[PDB]
Design a protein around this ligand. Structure first.
Ligand SMILES: Nc1ncnc2c1ncn2[C@@H]1O[C@H](CSCC[C@H](N)C(=O)O)[C@@H](O)[C@H]1O
Ligand SMILES: [Zn+2]
Ligand SMILES: [Zn+2]
Ligand SMILES: [Zn+2]
Ligand SMILES: [Zn+2]
Length: 904
DNA sequence: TCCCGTGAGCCTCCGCAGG
DNA sequence: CCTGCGGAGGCTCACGGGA
């Protein structure tokens, strides 16, 4: 029951209601009857589509300033008075200066190791705490203590209020209190997952406290309880918590292994380890840009305009911020200082490293990275010593010649892999040949995936590249997209119909649909994924009975229902960023409480498509879920550096800042992707040009290009066609400076004959702006008599859009609109339909006088050129606009492969 | 003195019978 | 096809806290 709507950008919608045709004249404000209820024949919006498009550039991501949670379960727990406290039985085991026991009595009551006690806080605002006593002992001086493994109330979790009052979660919080702090012996049951879980589908939207999942306070993750087993030297005082905290602390501290020699109070080792990684002499190493500085002199970096000619120019009041990639080096030596008398020394391990040169590092500077491979380096004779605890990872860098295979193949077969072919010298600024002493010493079953809301097959394409899934069933209502999907996934039958329809069938028990296709049944689906269009409630205000009801019938819950009658191993819900805040973050909390209700393992976070191989600002929300018998996937780690501005990854819900398992929040392995690298090899084409297929007048001129270009023997450049802008729009565009950052605000206020012979007049500021004043030439700056609106003050067919300055004063000067993309910059959140005056409309080709084309938009996304599309020009744009950056999906799918291989 | 923000109500048509 | 109708979004305008 959803109807589309007209867009408010394109010219067709701007043009005034003439009053010469049937409909337009029949209006009520024209004396007519109005019993027709229509719009002017000259207002028929072409870019017309459903307003399902949410994430309308909001400032909810800003104001990040906020401390970390981890309440510590508060402090100062009220103390209770006890009459009698006697032990029971013989001390289970009394080693050093303690004597543990089996049970205990507190005023006649019996507490046994394993029982869940309760404690009262110090503030009557925070509910009573619970914990599972892991031990009981008698210290030689402290007295009678006990170790309480804390229990996190459901009303203290992301679920907050939507959490089942009786549900508790395991938390790595625990202290050693004094028995007298106990209040009661509350019983807590463990609602473990049914043996035959994956079959409990159909269901509708407790009697005592129970726990079933472990909760991570800072990452908002819901994983299965640790299967950690005790030993014989602690079986009486075992604490899952401490064990985890102990192992985690052991993984942090960097240690060393084998040694080689002792010299100058500094032993030379051969191997060392950190956070689980094995660093050997000869391996690669990542390092912060503050590590060292190449001896190459670190590359060191108009009059007023005719006030009257360029009026709105004053409005310009308010990847340059992009950090530097990681530093790469070869580990030549590994050692540690020593205080005369002793030989070894931890906490101070050093590393001898051979500095590597990225093209954008040599004298040739940044422009060298235009044709270079994002993983190409240069060997040099420089070296530098860095504090081991500073490395940021492990990498692989080999000689490009000793590679026992094709270089293009070597890089694609590994994660962090680099390669060099020549040596560089800073002093002589020359490119010598790498010394000889520099050369090296010389699958699982695909998941049956079901992708509803498949679209043109964006997210699906990513997994098929990561070799993790196998889309066999795709649900797409929009015929265009559906058809396209089939063109890319011939091995899967596409159900081109409504989602609510199919689930209403299989649930009612059925084998096929009208067309006659095999429907997915219980167990057939291993993985579920898709992007549910959030339409019926793109709000941000508190939920209400009216809208809430409109939610319980949305396409988000329907996706959840599919996740219910299929209980797949892995469930993924991608969507716009603001999904984590819609309706006061409620929609998010509900879809989580919904997954947790199904006893699912789930988490959530935000990713910046750019950081994964895309010259585009596209933050999106991600909801990951895993079956009770699997491992909850981690979030992809940024592969490319990106402007800190479009990386407000953090998310806050009810005064609680939540983040992700991502470490690299600044630097990264590979350099950022630019518009140049994205679309520089594309031929010059004119506005409107609708040539479906054409050739590449020029070989690849960028890494990101040699990739997407494909390896097909057919040089077919498909869909390099762009929209046909109005003759007037073509004028506005041609009058936009190629100067990086130019937009409507820099348009000439003059008259010009269009390709229609018809001439567009100038703009008249017949009013004053009490917030802008006059021009440098005392000229007026007000467009409308409201600066009430005087409909007669409206002006049409003008170079500088009448509307812009009109509303300009309250929408940040529409900075960007009708702007051109700068080569060094990056596309703004790609959309489903490019329009100069569209919210996110800085879409004017860097140099050419037109709007980005479909193929260029394909490039903005991760879509290769081999990928096919379907439908008319506008139909295509929307497919690409909705789709998910394959490079994001891939990198997001690999974090899942590490879970399938986890098995257990 | 400005800002949202939260509706209630007028305004502007899109699908759709239904002819 | 209209030809006109039911009825959904959104766009505008009258307040009510909150700095
Ligand atoms: N419930 C539903 N059933 C079938 N198709 C739907 C649908 N809801 C929306 N669609 C269609 O699917 C399109 C969005 S598809 C979004 C796909 C996502 N970006 C991805 O590839 O990961 C819309 O144009 C809409 O017409
Ligand atoms: Zn329009
Ligand atoms: Zn008309
Ligand atoms: Zn403990
Ligand atoms: Zn006005």
């Amino acid at each position: 029951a959803f109807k589309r709507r007209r867009c408010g950008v394109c010219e067709v919608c701007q043009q005034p209601e003439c009053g010469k045709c049937k409909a337009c004249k029949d209006m009520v404000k024209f004396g007519g009857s109005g019993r027709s209820k229509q719009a002017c024949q000259e207002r028929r919006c072409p870019n017309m589509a459903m307003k399902e498009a949410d994430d309308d550039e909001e400032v909810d991501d800003n104001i990040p300033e906020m401390p970390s949670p981890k309440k510590m379960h508060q402090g100062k727990k009220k103390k209770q008075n006890k009459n009698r406290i006697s032990w029971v039985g013989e001390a289970v085991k009394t080693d050093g200066k303690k004597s543990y026991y089996k049970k205990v009595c507190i005023d006649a009551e019996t507490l046994e190791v394993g029982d869940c006690v309760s404690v009262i806080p110090d503030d009557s605002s925070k509910p009573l705490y619970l914990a599972r006593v892991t031990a009981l002992w008698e210290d030689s001086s402290n007295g009678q203590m006990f170790h309480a493994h804390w229990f996190c109330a459901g009303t203290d979790t992301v679920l907050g209020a939507t959490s089942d009052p009786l549900e508790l979660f395991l938390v790595d919080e625990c202290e050693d209190m004094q028995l007298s702090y106990i209040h009661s012996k509350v019983k807590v049951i463990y609602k473990a997952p049914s043996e035959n879980w994956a079959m409990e589908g159909g269901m509708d939207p407790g009697k005592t406290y129970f726990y079933q999942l472990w909760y991570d306070q800072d990452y908002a993750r819901f994983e299965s309880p640790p299967k950690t087993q005790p030993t014989e030297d602690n079986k009486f005082k075992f604490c899952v918590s401490c064990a985890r905290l102990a192992e985690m602390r052991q993984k942090e501290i960097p240690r060393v292994l084998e040694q080689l020699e002792d010299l100058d109070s500094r032993v030379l080792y051969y191997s060392a380890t950190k956070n689980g990684i094995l660093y050997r002499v000869g391996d690669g190493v990542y390092l912060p840009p503050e590590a060292f500085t190449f001896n190459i002199k670190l590359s060191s970096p108009k009059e007023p305009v005719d006030e009257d000619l360029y009026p709105e120019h004053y409005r310009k009041y308010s990847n340059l911020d992009a950090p530097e990639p990681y530093r790469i080096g070869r580990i030549k030596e590994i050692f540690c200082p020593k205080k005369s008398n002793g030989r070894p020394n931890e906490t101070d391990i050093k590393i001898r490293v051979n500095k590597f040169y990225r093209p954008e590092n040599t004298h040739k500077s940044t422009p060298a990275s235009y044709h270079a491979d994002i993983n190409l380096l240069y060997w040099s004779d420089e070296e530098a010593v860095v504090d081991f605890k500073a490395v940021q990872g492990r990498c692989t860098v080999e000689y490009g010649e000793d590679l026992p295979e094709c270089v293009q193949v070597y890089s694609m077969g590994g994660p962090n892999r680099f390669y060099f072919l020549e040596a560089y010298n800073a002093k002589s600024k020359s490119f010598e040949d790498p010394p000889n002493h520099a050369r090296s010493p010389g699958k699982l079953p695909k998941l049956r995936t079901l992708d509803v809301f498949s679209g043109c097959g964006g997210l699906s394409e990513g997994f098929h590249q990561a070799g993790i899934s196998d889309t066999l069933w795709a649900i797409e209502m929009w015929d265009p997209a559906a058809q396209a999907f089939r063109l890319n996934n011939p091995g899967s039958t596409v159900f081109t119909e409504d989602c609510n329809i199919l689930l209403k069938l299989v649930m009612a028990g059925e084998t096929t649909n009208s067309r006659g296709q095999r429907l997915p049944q219980k167990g057939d689906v291993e993985m579920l994924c898709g992007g549910p269009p959030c339409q019926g409630f793109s709000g941000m205000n508190r939920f209400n009975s009216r809208t809430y009801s409109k939610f319980k019938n949305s396409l988000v819950v329907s996706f959840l229902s599919y996740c219910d009658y299929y209980r797949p191993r892995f469930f993924l819900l991608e969507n716009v960023r603001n999904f984590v805040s819609f309706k006061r973050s409620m929609v998010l909390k509900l879809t989580l409480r919904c997954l947790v209700r199904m006893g699912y393992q789930c988490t959530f976070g935000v990713l910046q498509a750019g950081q994964y191989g895309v010259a585009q600002t596209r933050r999106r929300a991600i909801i990951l879920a895993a079956a009770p018998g699997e491992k909850l996937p981690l979030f992809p780690e940024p592969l490319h550096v990106f402007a800190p501005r479009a990386c407000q990854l953090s998310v806050v819900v009810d005064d609680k800042k939540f983040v992700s398992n991502i470490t690299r929040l600044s630097s990264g392995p590979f350099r950022t992707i630019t518009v140049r690298d994205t679309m520089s090899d594309l031929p010059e084409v004119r506005n409107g040009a609708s040539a479906l297929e054409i050739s590449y007048n020029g070989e690849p001129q960028s890494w990101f290009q040699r990739q997407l270009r494909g390896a097909q023997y057919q040089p077919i450049l498909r869909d390099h066609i762009c929209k046909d802008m109005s003759a007037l729009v073509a004028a506005r565009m041609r009058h936009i400076p190629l100067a990086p950052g130019s937009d409507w605000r820099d348009l000439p206020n003059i008259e010009v004959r269009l390709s229609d012979g018809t001439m567009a007049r100038k703009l008249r500021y017949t009013h004053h702006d009490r917030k802008n004043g006059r021009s440098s030439s005392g000229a007026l700056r007000g467009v409308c008599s409201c600066v009430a609106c005087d409909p007669a003050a409206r002006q049409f067919n003008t170079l500088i859009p009448w509307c812009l300055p009109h509303t300009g004063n309250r929408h940040n000067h529409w900075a960007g609109l009708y702007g051109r993309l700068e080569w060094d910059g990056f596309f703004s959140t790609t959309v489903t339909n490019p329009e100069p005056m569209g919210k996110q409309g800085r879409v004017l080709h860097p140099e050419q006088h037109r709007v980005v084309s479909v193929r260029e938009c394909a490039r903005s996304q991760g879509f290769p050129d081999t990928y096919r599309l379907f439908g008319n020009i506008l139909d295509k744009h929307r497919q690409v606009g909705n789709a998910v950056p394959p490079p994001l999906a891939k990198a997001i799918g690999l974090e899942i492969k590490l879970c399938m291989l986890a098995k257990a």
